[PDB]
RNA sequence: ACCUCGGAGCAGAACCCAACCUCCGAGCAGUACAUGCUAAGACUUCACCAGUCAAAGCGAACCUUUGAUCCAAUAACUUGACCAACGGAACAAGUUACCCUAGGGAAAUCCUAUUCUAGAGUCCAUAUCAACAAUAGGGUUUACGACCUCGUUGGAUCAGGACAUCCCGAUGGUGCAGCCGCUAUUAAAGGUUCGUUUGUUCAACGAUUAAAGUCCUACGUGAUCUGAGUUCAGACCGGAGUAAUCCAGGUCGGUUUCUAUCUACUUUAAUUCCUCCCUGUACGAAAGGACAAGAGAAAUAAGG
RNA sequence: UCCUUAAAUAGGGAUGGCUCCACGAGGGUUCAGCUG
RNA sequence: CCGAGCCUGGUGAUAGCUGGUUGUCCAAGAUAGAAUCUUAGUUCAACUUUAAAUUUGCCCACAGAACCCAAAUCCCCUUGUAAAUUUAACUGUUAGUCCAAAGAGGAACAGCUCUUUGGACACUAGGAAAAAACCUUGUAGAGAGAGUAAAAAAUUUAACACCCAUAGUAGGCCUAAAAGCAGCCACCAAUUAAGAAAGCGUUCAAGCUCAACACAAAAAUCCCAAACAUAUA
């Protein structure tokens, strides 16, 4: 039978090689994910379709910001083969109210407060 | 084998084994033996006069008759590997003996020279010429052997 | 009729797998 | 009894119960009181005729004072006629005695090719060598992507195509067939 | 045979489910006669119907397998048969080819050839054949009462094609001195008969042949013809059936019709055989008996 | 099993059981002749 | 036009069967259990639509769910989310097809018959040659802009060491003789180098090698893009 897949926890235990490869520090982890759907939910199980709808990834290639917290991460793990996850980087910190309308999400994953 | 799902076939192809590839080709990169040793060492002192020939063109019966005529005297015929005889020359300090033993070589170790009668026997068979030897650490060519016989 | 896997198909699958591995890393923290 | 004993065509007392073809064999995978053997490189069913020809071709070129051959598979018991299930990696016929592997290689290879499923003539040394080189393959492969890793992590949603048994077989065993080259 | 219900397989871990299917037993028995009355809250065979559990309270004592409604009977409480096709027509079987209408549709277990040599093969494997197995190629069968039974075809005409070659051609080997046979490779240009019995699909037989090949082509081909035979509508015989009728199980008889619209098409260096010469030559101890080459006769096919 | 043909799944002969005189656009077989 | 005439009427017989069922535009919209003289139908359920009321609904981290003796499932704090339940009204679909997976139909690999989980098709587009079911991808228009997704089959295999092997003795048992080749018993020994022999052949011998010295496939109308080995990834 085809069922939900239980991913072993060792899959989501990064190695120092992974840290060097991808440039994320396990200490002081990133706060927010940028998730984009890059794969169709057609020919995928209804639970993956539902998770995609919940995460708001109905449109492909449209970045969506989510919290980097265990529940959101569990949903992302369910649909990890359909999405691209990149940390949201804030070189100038989160935007202030003055420049809330002058932000731009660079393709590198950086939210810059000048545009 | 039944046809796999194409997605599974793609998975197998992607997960196919990839052997490690060395940068530079390693190829293109840089007690019978001791019994013979001791026996030949002993023989080199046992014999007083030595000679060598090429007793290979003879038949089994002819070689047997030659062996019988030699055993009529005290001389003993020997065959030993050149592969192991080449180290023996330098071991026994026989430098002039190196360009003498190659291919088939049959020694004629003795202490009493019946070389006159041996040459007489060899005469009736116009082949199998005598090859140079070295009696008591003194090299003798064929002419020297003939003079010694006479 | 049989079907065969091309180098392009293998490369596409490898690209997808690399994206998924990066997803694993970013989900690990 | 340094010979392959005759086996009954059918058990005298049928047994009720205690796919036996797919996947690696779990029993008789290692040499026991022998030095050479025939290894099954794939699952299959052995018939009574197959057993009889095994016995005939082994006891023909046999030296009772220097060779002793034993079975590793029981008599045909599974009803269909009666046959024996054999899984990949299962030894079929073992040999021992004062002998060398090349002395038996010829007819062992012949009888292995006779066998319905893929089979090989394997000594203890050759079995150890192939196990060690399989370990070397899986330790030195330069492919970052392995069937084991992808299937376990459900990368690409591949478990939609794979079987639950594929997670344990790691892609090496597909149905009754076995793929030793598959790392 | 089964049709309802219950228990087990049969589902590994909530439920549900493998229907069809396998096995078992119940239309209850034993017990008690509070084994009463009431009543929160729940379960449930995926609907409903129906079927379960139950605290508290009252009252006595001090439980382990099915069936509705109507209708009958009983003063009533209650009870009853049939509904077992067990969601149950109150009461109705066989048969139709004399039929009509409305529609729907059309792995194991066998054979062939190679491989291992088992082995036959005078001894001798590998001249030849060949076992079990493996490989391929072709065909048959299935999960269901392992009970019985039984479920369109040629011919004529014209042929197209394959080669897995029957003859003709070219070669290798031979357990063939020549003749031959046997075997294998290659070869599809060409060719591949007429009759008797049978409807024969076939088969046997007769006489030939160089040979009378194996197949594919929706029988290849039936808007080209014709014949069976399912099987028409008649009638006998045999078998089954109370009968009607049924049964390829035997026989005698027995009308489908097409004026061609479209596609396509409608004038693309011969083979055998025999006779003779060479040839009684080669070969061979003899017997027997050739190649290659040539000549002549026929016949067939094609074209005139 | 015999005859019939060279060849013959064809034909003929070795109250019931029988007897086919004649007849038949009945159903089979045959000699001879005749014939596109 | 008789297995039962014809005409008229009842009669617009009846038909769970066949066929048909006419403006424009938008929107929501999917396979599913039970019973049934029932499986070509229907009724209930489920789904579906509209309107309405209200408040939680789905996902799920632990904790938790059996003894006999696997993948997963159930349940719900968070969380991501915005739906869910109930009320009123209601038609229609519902004894499907294919794919992936796990099982049963006798301890039946394939084929079928079913059960279960999931997907797809009945819905768009691109690709896989053509293409319901494989891959990519969907929410709708115009554009003579742009970045991409899937998407290209691979392969070409067989030389080989050289050299020759005296002799105790045909080693004995029997076996006509069987000596190395009919069998079992030790399996020694000479030179230097040595099997009472691993394989051919002799009734048995004789003759020969090994070892030892030495140095894969096919078929039927007519093969089937054309072609191309090396210009920057
Ligand atoms: Mg049950
Ligand atoms: Mg219920
Ligand atoms: Mg009923
Ligand atoms: Mg009923
Ligand atoms: Mg009648
Ligand atoms: Mg041919
Ligand atoms: Mg009739
Ligand atoms: Mg008539
Ligand atoms: Mg006739
Ligand atoms: Mg009339
Ligand atoms: Mg009507
Ligand atoms: Mg819509
Ligand atoms: Mg009823
Ligand atoms: Mg109906």
- Residue D9: give the domain boundaries: 1-183
Answer yes or no: are the C-beta atoms of D39 and D91 closer than 8 Å.
yes
Q: Which residues contact A70 (CB under 8 A, 6 or more apart)?
A: none
Whether D5 sits with its Cβ under 7 A from any strand E atom: the answer reads no
User: Which experiment gave this structure?
Assistant: cryo-EM
> Taking the domains of chain B in order of start, what are their residue ranges?
1-150
Whether A12 sits with its Cβ under 7 A from any strand G atom: the answer reads no
| Three-class DSSP labels, chain B | CCCCCHHHHHHHHHCCCCCCCCCCCCCCCCCHHHHHHHHHHHHHHHCCECCEECCCCCCHHHHHHHHHHHHCCCCEEEECCHHHHHHHHHHCCCCCCHHHCCCCCEEEEECCCCHHHHHHHHHCCCCCCCECEEECCEEECHHHHHHHHC
Chain breaks after residues in chain D, where C lies over 2.5 Å from next N: 18, 80
Which residues are registered as beta bridge partners of A105? A111
CA of D160 to the centre of ligand 4 (A): 42
CA–CA distances in Å: residue C29 to residues A6, A18, A69, B76, C16? 19, 12, 9, 91, 21
C14 closest CB neighbour out of B6, B9, B14: B14
- In degrees rounded to 5, what are phi and psi of residue D32? -135, 110
Q: How far is CA B118 from the centre of its chain?
A: 23
Give the integer Cα–Cα distance in Å for A36 and A62. Answer: 6
Q: Are the Cβ atoms of C17 and B14 closer than 8 angstroms?
A: yes
CA of D15 to the centre of ligand 3 (A): 43
CA of C1 to the centre of ligand 6 (A): 29
Going by C-alpha positions, the residue among B144, B130, B131 that lies closest to residue B97 is B131
Burial zone of D115 (CB within 10 Å; 0-12 exposed, 13-18 middle, 19+ buried): buried
Give the integer Cα–Cα distance in Å for B83 and D165. Answer: 62
Whether D60 sits with its Cβ under 7 A from any strand E atom: the answer reads yes
Whether D163 sits with its Cβ under 7 A from any strand E atom: the answer reads no
Alpha carbon of D139: minimum distance to chain A alpha carbons (Å): 18
Question: CB neighbours (10 Å) of residue C20?
Answer: 22
Answer yes or no: are the C-beta atoms of A83 and A34 closer than 8 Å.
no
Report the residue of chain B nearest D159, measured CA to CA.
Answer: B8
> Taking the domains of chain A in order of start, what are their residue ranges?
1-115
Burial zone of B45 (CB within 10 Å; 0-12 exposed, 13-18 middle, 19+ buried): exposed
Going by C-alpha positions, the residue among B132, B72, B141 that lies closest to residue B107 is B132
Chains contacting chain A through 3 or more C-beta pairs under 8 A? C, D
Give how many domains chain D has, as a whole number.
1
What long-range pairs does C19-22 form, CB within 8 A, spacing at least 24? Answer: C19/A38, C19/A84, C20/A80, C20/A81, C20/D153, C20/D155, C20/D156, C21/D155, C22/A22, C22/A84, C22/A85, C22/A86
Residue B88 CA to nucleotide G62 C1', Å? Answer: 86
Going by C-alpha positions, the residue among A66, A79, A71, A63 that lies closest to residue A33 is A66
Give the integer Cα–Cα distance in Å for C11 and C17. Answer: 10
Q: Which residues of C touch A26 (CB under 8 A)?
A: 28-29
CA–CA distances in Å: residue B37 to residues B42, B52, B83? 9, 19, 12
A76 closest CB neighbour out of C19, C22, C27: C27
CA–CA distances in Å: residue A25 to residues A18, A107, A108? 10, 20, 17
Side-chain half-sphere of B93: how many Cα atoms within 13 Å? 4
């Amino acid at each position: 039978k085809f069922t939900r897949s239980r991913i072993p926890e060792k899959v989501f235990q990064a190695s120092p090689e992974d840290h060097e490869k991808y440039g994320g520090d396990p200490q002081n982890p990133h706060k927010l994910h940028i998730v984009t759907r890059i794969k169709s939910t057609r020919r995928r199980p209804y639970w993956e379709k539902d998770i995609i709808k919940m995460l708001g990834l109905e449109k492909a290639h449209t970045p969506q910001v989510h919290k980097n917290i265990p529940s959101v991460n569990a949903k992302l793990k369910v649909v990890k083969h359909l999405i691209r996850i990149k940390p949201l980087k804030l070189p100038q910190g989160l935007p202030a109210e003055e420049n809330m309308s002058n932000t731009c999400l660079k393709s590198t994953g950086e939210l810059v407060v000048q545009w | 084998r039944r046809v796999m799902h194409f997605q599974r076939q793609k998975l197998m192809a992607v997960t196919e084994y990839i052997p490690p590839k060395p940068a530079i080709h390693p190829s293109c990169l840089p007690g019978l033996i001791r019994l013979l040793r001791r026996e030949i060492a002993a023989v080199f002192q046992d014999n007083r006069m030595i000679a060598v020939c090429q007793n290979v063109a003879l038949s089994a019966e002819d070689k047997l008759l030659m062996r019988h005529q030699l055993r009529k005297h005290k001389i003993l015929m020997k065959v030993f590997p050149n592969q192991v005889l080449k180290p023996f020359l330098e071991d026994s300090k026989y430098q002039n003996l190196l360009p003498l033993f190659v291919g088939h070589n049959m020694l004629l170790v003795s202490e009493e020279p019946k070389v006159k009668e041996m040459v007489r026997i060899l005469r009736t068979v116009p082949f199998l010429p005598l090859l140079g030897g070295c009696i008591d650490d003194t090299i003798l060519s064929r002419q020297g052997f003939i003079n010694y016989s006479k | 009729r049989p079907r065969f896997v091309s180098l392009r198909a293998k490369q596409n699958m490898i690209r997808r797998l690399e994206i998924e591995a990066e997803n694993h890393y970013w989900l690990s923290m | 009894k340094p010979k392959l004993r005759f086996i009954e065509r059918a058990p005298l007392v049928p047994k009720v119960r205690r796919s036996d073809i797919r996947g690696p064999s779990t029993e008789a995978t290692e040499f026991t009181e022998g030095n050479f053997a025939i290894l099954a490189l794939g699952g299959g069913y052995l018939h009574w005729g197959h057993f009889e020809m095994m016995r005939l071709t082994i006891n023909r070129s046999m030296d009772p004072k220097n060779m002793f051959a034993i079975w590793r598979v029981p008599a045909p018991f599974k009803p269909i006629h009666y046959v024996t299930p054999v899984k990949a990696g299962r030894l079929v016929v073992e040999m021992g005695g004062r002998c060398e592997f090349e002395e038996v290689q010829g007819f062992l290879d012949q009888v292995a090719h006779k066998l319905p499923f893929a089979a090989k003539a394997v000594s203890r040394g050759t079995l150890e060598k192939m196990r060690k080189d399989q370990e070397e393959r899986e330790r030195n492969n330069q492919n970052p992507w392995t069937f084991e890793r992808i299937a376990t992590a459900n990368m690409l949603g591949i478990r939609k195509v794979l079987s639950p048994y594929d997670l344990t077989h790691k892609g090496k065993y597909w149905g009754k067939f076995y793929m030793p080259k598959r790392v």
